[PDB]
Structure 1
Amino acid sequence: QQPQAKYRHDYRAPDYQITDIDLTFDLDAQKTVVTAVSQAVRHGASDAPLRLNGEDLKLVSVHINDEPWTAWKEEEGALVISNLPERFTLKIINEISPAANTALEGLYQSGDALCTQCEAEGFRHITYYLDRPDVLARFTTKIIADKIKYPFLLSNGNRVAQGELENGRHWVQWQDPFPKPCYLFALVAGDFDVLRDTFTTRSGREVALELYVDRGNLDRAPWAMTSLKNSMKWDEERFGLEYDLDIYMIVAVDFFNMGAMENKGLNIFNSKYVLARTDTATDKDYLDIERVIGHEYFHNWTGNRVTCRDWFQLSLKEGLTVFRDQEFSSDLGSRAVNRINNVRTMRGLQFAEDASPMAHPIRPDMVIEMNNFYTLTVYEKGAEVIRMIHTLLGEENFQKGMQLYFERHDGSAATCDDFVQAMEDASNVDLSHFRRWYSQSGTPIVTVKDDYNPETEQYTLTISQRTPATPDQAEKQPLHIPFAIELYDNEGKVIPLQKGGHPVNSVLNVTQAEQTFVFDNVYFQPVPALLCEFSAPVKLEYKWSDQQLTFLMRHARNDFSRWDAAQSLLATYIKLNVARHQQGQPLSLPVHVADAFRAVLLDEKIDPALAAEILTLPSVNEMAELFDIIDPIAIAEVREALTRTLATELADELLAIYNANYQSEYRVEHEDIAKRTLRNACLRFLAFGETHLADVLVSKQFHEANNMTDALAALSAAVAAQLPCRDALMQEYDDKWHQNGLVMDKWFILQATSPAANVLETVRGLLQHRSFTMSNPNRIRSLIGAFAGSNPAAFHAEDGSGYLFLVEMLTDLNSRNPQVASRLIEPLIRLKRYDAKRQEKMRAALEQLKGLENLSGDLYEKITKALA
């Protein structure tokens, strides 16, 4: 029987608490023996039994105060112990097999090392325990292993004991003084190179930093170490927070499902977010390592010192920590580029999730498998909700709320409501209506109409809002939407906002279904910038003219507004030509639209970081969100045709800007990164010029590149334009990098996203490639996931071959690695967005998976919602 769902309104405090736990591991890959001594305290009724969670455990013994216990019974996923006193010592001994753990949750094998992953509910795969985040205990961990095979034995906290044994075994004991929920426990055993450094806090605490990597990779760790130090200094300056322990350890592992994990004092990272060298890593990799390193470090306060009362409160730490890593990257790098890409993700990927059968509020109300809810909504929309609080309060009040949040809840497990109340009490801003953002799903739609009265010199905005019903909620109500505006006159000068002789704040409080806002002393009919900086996560409906948008592309004060205006301009003609493609007609584009992008290329006063993003066309997933019914083949071909048209009309300007931004020296510095993004944005268009010219330029950049950023941009362009040099370049890349999995991932992504007519045939053949393996999540997502998620034109082939391919892959991964399978099934859940003939084939595919033997709960939850 598949699992029953759990509901947020059923939360009840635990009948039993555990205050301290002493763990002993006798490590072995085939068999590990765990001994756990816990000090327990009963808070519930005297006749309530102790219910411990446990999965795939071989129980060996159960003692209460050293007495072998007889009043216990094992049930599905639990050990139930009865007739207990109010205080006692529980001792459990059980066995596990890390070598058989292909799901990568609990204690498992990563190559030759042993490591753990315990969030959300993985610790119960190690021993019987109260595997819930509102139980906080002080841990002490003793590890015993073969010295030659496992010379390094790591756990949370500080080393407090160590010894050697006979038969070549040794041991180390660790102690972590901060109580924690078990999902923050970590253990690592293996042989590593160690990069060691130090960081001194502003108050004088010296912290030892230790980065563990595979033998031979010390020259790939310096940037990660630098990013850690940068994270520690920034948190002090911006939030006034210092690290609270003596050591900070990071371990890079090749086999990892969840990107990275914030285990107290012992983070475990996917190698993709640690290792970097200029010849193997791109600018995006460097900046991703920075953001992930920061994200995990910032969890030390927003997550660890204050954790979650229950898993429905996940956004309490993830939304706030994402917001923190966004501010970190924005302060240190380009704020405009960070915001633009964060908005592309919201519009392009999160809106669709909110328009799917899996839609949920940032604080879910119902969950079957908690691992299915580490989502764009909980993370990305969660951060937008935090940012809206920052917008309503301001930086000063916002930090006051942070400090009150920590004062009240440091050392406990809190809820989302606790956080909002702290911000409300500290700032004196009423957030009662704002709380609805936590409980209501779906994307609000904000409609705006304006009117200028020359007689009275008044400008009136009539703003309405509505949220369409979602599969999970039939009731929707208006929200508190912060709506930021700016009014520009005929010269591009900002018009002061005022009413009745008093200034009016530029952040409007849109709180009702319909409302009017009147402004005085509007001397000239203005051009509005609406929803500035994406001030709320909503869809905007305003009948722009092409001239208003090109005006904003020229005169808007904030760089984000200039990019946003260009997106609105493109959207109108993306929709035009998709309709034309469906009727067999070629692309049509007014002359004045191409000229607006010509002016961007030739504007010497525009930040090249911004110009590069305006010259980056929306992705196929961003384009899909513009349509009621997705035609993935028309979207893909219209994107190419638009690229070809602009490449021909702007050929001369593109080549000039491309040559002007050449850089002989390669530096990982934001100004250098910006020029390089603008150069490679021009290269995308130039690849679609005359064949002989494009093939020479692309091949030249590939062979002369002194860094992987420029080499991969050329290789990507050769695949995208199907240039004659493609096959040769792709073979050289393979011949050179086939032994480096991280570098080959980029190669698989290009194969899976290729516009070639035989892409599926090539993808299937790559299942036997020397660098691919179904045992590594990174390889799976780079080839299979990129195909189903990032090549919808091929995944949605009219013959249904894409659906059948994915069914085969998921049949394997459902038994091997359900967590990775659940991420790969997401393209099938969106069937209702497509045409009826495609829906029929996709339902048939879901029905096949629905009838699998040993269907995991991960897929059962999604399949059930999809077929409803």
Structure 2
Amino acid sequence: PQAKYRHDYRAPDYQITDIDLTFDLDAQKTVVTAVSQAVRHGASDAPLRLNGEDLKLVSVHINDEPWTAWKEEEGALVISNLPERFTLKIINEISPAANTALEGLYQSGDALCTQCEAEGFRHITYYLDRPDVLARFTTKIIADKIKYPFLLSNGNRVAQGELENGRHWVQWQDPFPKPCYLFALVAGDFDVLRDTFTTRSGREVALELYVDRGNLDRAPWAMTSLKNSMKWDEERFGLEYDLDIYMIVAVDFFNMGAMENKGLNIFNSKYVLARTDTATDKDYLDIERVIGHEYFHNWTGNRVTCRDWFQLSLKEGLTVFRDQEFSSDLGSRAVNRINNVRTMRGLQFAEDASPMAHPIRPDMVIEMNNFYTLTVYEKGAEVIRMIHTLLGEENFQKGMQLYFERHDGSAATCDDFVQAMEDASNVDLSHFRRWYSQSGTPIVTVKDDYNPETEQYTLTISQRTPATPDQAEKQPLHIPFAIELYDNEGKVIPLQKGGHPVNSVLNVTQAEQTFVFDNVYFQPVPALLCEFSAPVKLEYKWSDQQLTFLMRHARNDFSRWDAAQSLLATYIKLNVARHQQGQPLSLPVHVADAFRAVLLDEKIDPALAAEILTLPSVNEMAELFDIIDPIAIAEVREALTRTLATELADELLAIYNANYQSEYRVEHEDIAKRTLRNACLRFLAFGETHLADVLVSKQFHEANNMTDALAALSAAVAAQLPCRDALMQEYDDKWHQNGLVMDKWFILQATSPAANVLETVRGLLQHRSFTMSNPNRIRSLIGAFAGSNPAAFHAEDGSGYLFLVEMLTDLNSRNPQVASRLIEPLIRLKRYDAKRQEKMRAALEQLKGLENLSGDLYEKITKALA
């Protein structure tokens, strides 16, 4: 497999302006007829090079003349000796039923559906499968009427007819030129939820949600979320939907989350289907986020698309930023920010420290499907958010407006977007652009001094980004570094110098810099990197008392949570070192006291309290350490939970009881109380065994919603309570027919602290609700074990690695995209001790030797073994 390079970008030799597709659909053999209007832009002797994968070519015509001047080669059809403008007609066959990779045209249950991003359309026909080629599509679909009564593609229905032998057809036209990755086709039999949204300017939009027969009871929340998304994009960004119909199809078999195909989004059913007895608060909020995300792509991705795939973050960073802003505006901004920061520090930082490290705009890609990453998406959003911090909302929106004005109807670059922001705002972003080209996580070190003689406070701030495997050279970035200074009363000290106010967002642009503030009338307690103002590691020598002071006094809820994280980090590190020496947990009394105060504080938002009372995950804890000890981390997390459960037992029960809610509502105040109550339950499960078992079993059985039922079941598994097996069996018996609900149970099985977890996981490969044919099942059982049970995955006997090798040997052939998701825990080997590294290296070497090794795995394995 050959690497492709961003610096090799060249405008295409040919454009296609219009394509008319016909599908004669059948699961075994689909015939595709594609009639494209092409125009040569390059040299008169340049051949037309069409991408194609696994196609059976039937015929090639140019202006209806059977063409003799062509050859097929690896991944391509190369057509020579063409006029400047011509009609290309290709007929080819494909086999949806044979498509286990779920890219191109494939089967999802009884339905046929497509996935074309990034380079899936070339699995359907020979085409210019590159996103800077935009064409107007029309799509004719011919199929068996009984099997496929609904035949959907992008845009509007313009023709329909009936044929002999029980077949029918529909033709669709989408007026907006698009790259082929935004093409979609769906055929099948569905229940349809229909509704309407009227845009602010009065365009009435038909909304249609297609779900498997029998699932209409689970569709209204997604529909509500769609309307919410449409309204928000109007209010916040001034953007209206631009077509007459908005279709969403929920499919059970899907490699990712959802796909923004113009006017015909295709969603993993996990991000559509919800009922109060099947879905948790988190599921509801995820459906909201993902519905919003795909909707927001209509402008940031569709109306303006990507010139090439190295520009992926142009749409993904900006659309993730938009979905976060949406969720934050509608819900708790603090809880959203907190959770997004947990993801950055606990998951994205790990990727940036790994062999797969890349800038948000990559320079080199072998398999583009490998680059739909925490970096491109989540760090991409942090970079957008930094622009927002630097510009402020008004200038940011001016930048958005200039971006659309310039680039609407075209494929653009990351640099185009940055230039629009810079030009609209008059803020210089030339240095800022390095965030697009540099990989790795900057470390920002802060030292301070208070001078009582002069009433000056001095911050000396330094930065460095360690070298990464992809980049030997690193340079200083433009880091927006937000601060707040507090006096002894918890009041904010005005920032000023030489008689002028100073902006609280410091521009940290050098390797080292000093900032001096005057009229600092009392020695301050600083709040540093407020609202996680840049995606960086902060090094500052906090005292415990400074941190508990911030937990009490900090103005923004994020700062209060973040101070608690810094307080915990010190004692997590302490207790992991202790674990390694065979010593039990040690925690100062004043630390337990800070958490008691949070529990008992009547004024604190329960949403905030709940997050402070949610310990960092084992993945967040891992990032505190150069070399990860996953067993020590897991056991310390449990010991810390048990210690707090004992110290806080009375308070935890009081708050648990106080937050009881008889009515279940998917409403932010109720969700916040429930999140707090269940945070309390988690500790209570790890307290005195009989009371724990009673509380947990009672909640599981009395729950009137899945959030409370699953919180109880999860606690029973985590604390290995007596009731565990009975409750787990009860859930299986009730829910085994429901794959999405069973995913929750597979996750609990996979992440269990039980000594025999791997045995159980292997046995579950035979479970009635599990199948290797479904990405959701695979991720919930196998992915959760390897990625979310590092203590078991990294068992000292190497059994976890051997298990994953077995699974990846299957998935490499079946579904390389899912295989490549699942190999990630193995490529982290350099973070582990020598003995583990050698077993992980052996595992990777076994996979490297596989017959028919996918490009997806090849790329990751070679980087890991380098």
**Interval containing the TM-score (normalised by the shorter chain):** over 0.9
| Deviations 1:344-363, CA, capped at 9 Å, x for gaps | 00000000100000000000
TM superposition shift of 1:560: 0.2
Q: How large is the RMSD of aligned CA atoms in angstroms?
A: 0.4
Deviation at 1:468, TM superposition (A): 0.3
Which residue of the partner structure matches residue 678 of structure 1? Answer: 676
CA distance in 2 between partners of 1:126 and 1:522 (Å): 67
**How far is the alpha carbon of 1:259 from its aligned partner?**
1.0
Q: Any idea what SS the aligned residue of 1:314 has?
A: helix
Does residue 796 of structure 2 align to residue 798 of structure 1? yes
> Given the two structures, how large is their TM-score scaled by the length of structure 2?
1.00
CA displacement 1:605-645 (0-9 Å, x = unmatched): 00000000000000000000001110000000000000000
- Aligned positions, number: 866
Query: SS at the partner of 2:484?
Result: strand
Shift of 1:53: 0.2
Distance 1:588 1:252 in 2: 50
The aligned residue for residue 16 of structure 2 is 18
Q: How much has 1:508 moved relative to structure 2?
A: 0.3
**TM-superposition CA deviations, 1:209-237 (whole Å, max 9, x none):** 00000111111100000000000000000
Offset of residue 143 of structure 1 = 0.3
Cα shift at 1:866: 0.4
- 1:337 is displaced (CA, Å) by 0.1
CA distance in 2 between partners of 1:427 and 1:732 (Å): 59
- How far apart, in 2, do the equivalents of 1:461 and 1:16 lie? 56
Measure how far apart 1:76 and its partner are.
0.4
Q: Do residues 573 (structure 1) and 590 (structure 2) align?
A: no
Counting aligned pairs with the same residue, the percent is 100
Task: After superposition, give the CA deviation of every residue in 1:358-384 in whole Å (9 maximum; x if it has no partner).
Answer: 000000000000000000000000000
Cα deviation, residue 393, structure 1: 0.3
Residue by residue over 1:145-166, the C-alpha shift from the partner in whole angstroms, topping out at 9 and shown as x without a partner, is 0001100000000000000000
CA offsets per residue over residues 156-184 of structure 1, 9 Å max, x none? 00000000000000000000000000000
Give, in angstroms, the shift of residue 265 of structure 1. 0.2
Q: 1:38 and 2:36 equivalent?
A: yes
Describe how 1:105-504 pairs up with structure 2 within 5 A: 105-504=103-502
Give the Cα separation in 2 of the matches to 1:177 and 1:346.
39
- Aligned partner of 2:786 in structure 1 is 788
Secondary structure in 2 aligned to 1:433? coil
Distance in 2 between residues matched to 1:693 and 1:194, nearest whole Å: 47
Listed one character per residue, the Cα deviations across residues 633-692 of structure 1 (whole Å, up to 9, x for unaligned) are 000000000000000000000000000000000011000000000000000000011111
Once residues 526 and 190 of structure 1 are traced to their aligned partners in structure 2, the CA distance between those partners, rounded to angstroms, is 65
SS at match of 2:749: helix
SS in 2 for 1:210: strand
Q: What is the DSSP-based 3-state SS (H/G/I as helix, E as strand, rest coil) of the residue aligned with 2:489?
A: coil
2-structure distance, mates of 1:500, 1:607: 38
**1:781-832 deviation line (CA, Å, top 9, x unaligned):** 0000000000000000000000000000000000000000000000000000
Q: Kindly state the Cα deviation for residue 258 of structure 1 after the two structures are TM-superposed.
A: 1.5
Q: Which residue of 1 aligns with 2:57?
A: 59
Deviation at 1:712, TM superposition (A): 0.3
Q: Residue by residue, what CA displacement relative to the aligned partner does 1:167-211 show, whole Å, maximum 9, x if unpaired?
A: 000000000000000000000000000000000001010000000
In 1, distance between residues paired with 2:454 and 2:810? 70
C-alpha deviation, 1:597, in angstroms: 0.2
Question: 3-state DSSP class of the match of 1:384?
Answer: helix
CA distance in 2, matches of 1:802, 1:832: 17
CA deviation map 1:83-122 (0-9, x unaligned): 0000000000000000000000000000001000000000
Q: SS of the residue aligned with 2:810?
A: helix
Q: What is the rounded CA distance, in whole Å, between the counterparts of 1:66 and 1:451 in structure 2?
A: 80
C-alpha distance in structure 2 between counterparts of 1:690 and 1:366, whole Å: 55
Distance 2:182 2:342 in 1: 32
> What is the rounded CA distance, in whole Å, between the counterparts of 1:14 and 1:833 in structure 2?
43
- Mapped partners of 1:342, 1:747: distance in 2: 25
Determine the C-alpha separation between the residues in 2 that align with 1:250 and 1:126. Answer: 21
1:667 alignment partner, SS class = coil
The DSSP-based 3-state class of the residue aligned with 2:429 is coil
1:762 positional shift: 0.3
Render the CA deviation track for 1:230-272: whole Å, top value 9, x for unaligned: 0000000000000000000000000000210000000000000
Q: Structure 2: how far apart are the matches of 1:325 and 1:362? A: 18
In 2: Cα distance, 1:830 partner to 1:573 partner: 25
Runs of 4+ more than 4 Å apart: none
Query: Unaligned regions of 5+ residues in structure 1, if any?
Result: none
Q: What is the rounded CA distance, in whole Å, between the counterparts of 2:186 and 2:571 in structure 1?
A: 54
Q: Displacement of 1:341 after TM fit? A: 0.2
SS of residue in 2 equivalent to 1:487? strand
SS in 1 for 2:433: helix
- 1:518 pairs with one of 516, 520, 537: 516
Which SS does the other structure have where 1:276 is aligned? coil
Question: 1:856 offset after TM fit, Å?
Answer: 0.3
Deviation for aligned residue 1:72? 0.3
SS in 1 for 2:538: strand
Tell me, in whole angstroms, the C-alpha distance in 2 between the residues paired with 1:177 and 1:23. 14
Counterparts of 1:66 and 1:541, CA distance in 2: 69
Cα deviations by residue, 1:49-93 (Å, 9 ceiling, x for unpaired):
000000000000000001001000000010000000000000000
Q: Could you tell me how far 1:403 is from its partner in structure 2?
A: 0.3
**Helix, strand or coil at the partner of 2:357:** coil
Shift of 1:135: 0.2
DSSP 3-state at the match of 1:245: coil
User: Which residue of the partner structure matches residue 101 of structure 1?
Assistant: 99
- Distance (whole Å) between structure 1 residues aligned to residue 499 and residue 623 of structure 2: 43
Cα deviation, residue 549, structure 1: 0.3
| Structure 2 stretches lacking a partner, 5+ long | none
Q: Per-residue deviation at 1:598?
A: 0.2
Report Cα offsets for 1:413-463 as digits up to 9, x if no partner: 000000000000000000000000000000000000110111111000000
Q: Alignment partner for residue 618 of structure 2, among 620, 629, 632? A: 620
Aligned mate of 2:764, from 766, 771, 785: 766
